[PDB]
Design an enzyme around this catalytic site. Structure first.
Site, PDB file in Angstrom:
ATOM      1  CE1 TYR A  60      -3.028   2.821   0.530  1.00  0.00           C
ATOM      2  CE2 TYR A  60      -4.405   0.850   1.775  1.00  0.00           C
ATOM      3  CZ  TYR A  60      -4.430   2.283   1.837  1.00  0.00           C
ATOM      4  OH  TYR A  60      -5.815   3.407   1.190  1.00  0.00           O
ATOM      5  CB  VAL A 110       7.263   5.232  -3.710  1.00  0.00           C
ATOM      6  CG1 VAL A 110       7.079   3.797  -2.461  1.00  0.00           C
ATOM      7  CG2 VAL A 110       6.718   4.804  -4.739  1.00  0.00           C
ATOM      8  CG  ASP A 132      -5.483   6.721  -1.474  1.00  0.00           C
ATOM      9  OD1 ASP A 132      -6.288   7.561  -1.852  1.00  0.00           O
ATOM     10  OD2 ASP A 132      -5.748   7.303   0.038  1.00  0.00           O
ATOM     11  CE  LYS A 163      -6.547  10.361  -4.633  1.00  0.00           C
ATOM     12  NZ  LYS A 163      -6.274  10.036  -3.444  1.00  0.00           N
ATOM     13  CB  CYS A 166     -11.123  11.502 -15.922  1.00  0.00           C
ATOM     14  SG  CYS A 166     -10.780  12.127 -16.925  1.00  0.00           S
ATOM     15  N   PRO A 167      -9.472  14.332 -15.211  1.00  0.00           N
ATOM     16  CG  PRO A 167      -6.696  14.654 -15.846  1.00  0.00           C
ATOM     17  CD  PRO A 167      -8.027  13.341 -15.901  1.00  0.00           C
ATOM     18  CG  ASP A 170     -12.511  22.472 -17.588  1.00  0.00           C
ATOM     19  OD1 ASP A 170     -12.576  22.223 -17.198  1.00  0.00           O
ATOM     20  OD2 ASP A 170     -13.523  24.159 -16.973  1.00  0.00           O
ATOM     21  CB  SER A 193     -15.905  12.744  -5.021  1.00  0.00           C
ATOM     22  OG  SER A 193     -14.786  12.452  -5.638  1.00  0.00           O
TER      23      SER A 193
HETATM   24  N1  LIG Z   1       5.613   8.992  -4.103  1.00  0.00           N
HETATM   25  C1  LIG Z   1       5.180   8.633  -2.716  1.00  0.00           C
HETATM   26  N2  LIG Z   1       5.071   8.073  -1.722  1.00  0.00           N
HETATM   27  C2  LIG Z   1       4.506   7.454  -0.939  1.00  0.00           C
HETATM   28  N3  LIG Z   1       3.348   8.505  -0.174  1.00  0.00           N
HETATM   29  C3  LIG Z   1       3.055   9.183  -1.078  1.00  0.00           C
HETATM   30  C4  LIG Z   1       4.036   9.585  -2.241  1.00  0.00           C
HETATM   31  N4  LIG Z   1       3.179  11.244  -3.054  1.00  0.00           N
HETATM   32  C5  LIG Z   1       2.260  11.352  -2.004  1.00  0.00           C
HETATM   33  N5  LIG Z   1       1.646  10.161  -1.125  1.00  0.00           N
HETATM   34  C6  LIG Z   1       1.045  10.068   0.463  1.00  0.00           C
HETATM   35  O1  LIG Z   1       0.199   9.691  -0.313  1.00  0.00           O
HETATM   36  C7  LIG Z   1      -0.642  10.355   0.293  1.00  0.00           C
HETATM   37  C8  LIG Z   1      -1.849  11.346  -0.459  1.00  0.00           C
HETATM   38  S1  LIG Z   1      -3.465  10.463   1.149  1.00  0.00           S
HETATM   39  C9  LIG Z   1      -3.468   8.624   1.618  1.00  0.00           C
HETATM   40  C10 LIG Z   1      -4.148   9.072   2.979  1.00  0.00           C
HETATM   41  C11 LIG Z   1      -4.655   6.966   2.858  1.00  0.00           C
HETATM   42  N6  LIG Z   1      -4.926   5.653   2.027  1.00  0.00           N
HETATM   43  C12 LIG Z   1      -5.373   6.464   4.355  1.00  0.00           C
HETATM   44  O2  LIG Z   1      -6.125   5.383   4.237  1.00  0.00           O
HETATM   45  O3  LIG Z   1      -5.613   7.540   5.516  1.00  0.00           O
HETATM   46  C13 LIG Z   1       0.041  11.337   1.415  1.00  0.00           C
HETATM   47  O4  LIG Z   1       0.137  10.419   2.966  1.00  0.00           O
HETATM   48  C14 LIG Z   1       1.092  11.667   1.177  1.00  0.00           C
HETATM   49  O5  LIG Z   1       2.320  11.410   1.438  1.00  0.00           O
END
Ligand SMILES: Nc1ncnc2c1ncn2[C@@H]1O[C@H](CSCC[C@H](N)C(=O)O)[C@@H](O)[C@H]1O
Length: 285
Positions: A60, A110, A132, A163, A166-167, A170, A193
């Site tokens: 994750y 990462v 995510d 996650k 789509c952007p 516009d 959302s």
């Molecule tokens: N390259 C990367 N590697 C790991 N985490 C990253 C990242 N870039 C952003 N993030 C992380 O992605 C997260 C988005 S919010 C995630 C919420 C989490 N899934 C929950 O269940 O509570 C942030 O905590 C951010 O630090």
């Protein structure tokens, strides 16, 4: 009152049978952990049904704080499924995840290079990826989607949950590819959302991608607007349940696919149970 009778809720994007010209957020506390918990419990239950969960390592990425992950971990752990959790994020996780031998917490954002080292280190275990990560702009999005594709190519998992939003048309920058998978719709997502989760299972050594264009963007926006504006505001009168709002009806359908040790006389009894269980855990009234 916006009353209606429904057979079943829309479970995937493709199911939405109508659109609305998008007009230019949450009713419950900890709604976000709820939104995440339901989708990931739904995804992982599916993998279990396919026999690809036991013995896998769940990677994750973008897992912090991850309060709801503790519940997911306990659920499968109590079921007897053997899973190793590897939660990687630059932010810190909720301390309730500490002290569990089956869950490794990594404080690292990462990058492609890192993915290679963990791939070397996780080897030879089978990987289930859940992403995510969050940087936003169309450029921020594309960059996230680009990283998510590199996660799959390097990690080479057996299944993935990504996650996906789509952007806005516009604010289009360029066409891109995302992994082929099911566009799972999320109950309890913010009011307007347009986010969903991409669920894929990988067979053979192939990787199928799909192109997304601005016209697709227009379609995503209109379908997601009608769902949010009209559908989610329905009171399913034929839904015999303590709460008849659309989101509870939608949640019932994901929860009815979850496996429990305790046997119930009806699906309704199980869902009521899991939901009580979930809300109590999240401290939602
Ligand atoms: N390259 C990367 N590697 C790991 N985490 C990253 C990242 N870039 C952003 N993030 C992380 O992605 C997260 C988005 S919010 C995630 C919420 C989490 N899934 C929950 O269940 O509570 C942030 O905590 C951010 O630090």
């Amino acid at each position: 009152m916006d009353v209606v009778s429904l057979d079943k809720p829309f479970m995937y994007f493709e199911e939405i049978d109508n659109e609305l010209d998008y007009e230019p957020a949450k009713k419950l506390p900890y709604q976000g952990q709820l939104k995440l918990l339901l989708g990931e419990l739904f995804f992982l239950s599916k993998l279990q049904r396919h026999g690809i969960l036991d013995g896998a390592t769940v990677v994750y990425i973008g897992s912090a704080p991850g309060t709801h992950i503790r519940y997911l971990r306990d659920h499968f752990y109590n079921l007897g499924v053997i899973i190793k959790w590897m939660l990687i994020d630059g932010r810190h996780h909720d301390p309730i995840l500490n002290g569990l031998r089956d869950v490794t917490l990594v404080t690292r954002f990462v990058d492609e290079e890192y993915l290679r080292s963990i791939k070397k280190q996780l080897h030879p275990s089978k990987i289930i990826l859940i992403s995510d990560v969050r940087s936003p702009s169309t450029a921020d999005l594309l960059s996230n989607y680009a990283l998510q594709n590199v996660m799959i190519s390097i990690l080479n998992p057996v299944a993935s949950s990504l996650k996906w939003r789509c952007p806005f048309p516009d604010q289009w920058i360029k066409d891109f590819y995302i992994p082929h998978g099911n566009k799972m719709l999320q109950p309890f997502a913010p009011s307007y959302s347009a986010e969903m989760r991409l669920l894929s299972i990988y067979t053979g050594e192939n990787m199928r991608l799909t192109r997304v264009t601005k016209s697709d963007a227009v379609n995503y926006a209109k379908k997601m607007y009608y769902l949010n504006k009209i559908v989610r505001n329905k009171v399913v009168v034929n839904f015999d349940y303590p709460n008849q709002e659309y989101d509870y009806f939608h949640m019932y359908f994901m929860l009815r696919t979850v496996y429990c040790n305790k046997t119930f006389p009806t699906t309704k009894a199980k869902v009521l149970f899991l939901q009580q269980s979930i809300f109590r855990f999240l401290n939602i009234p």
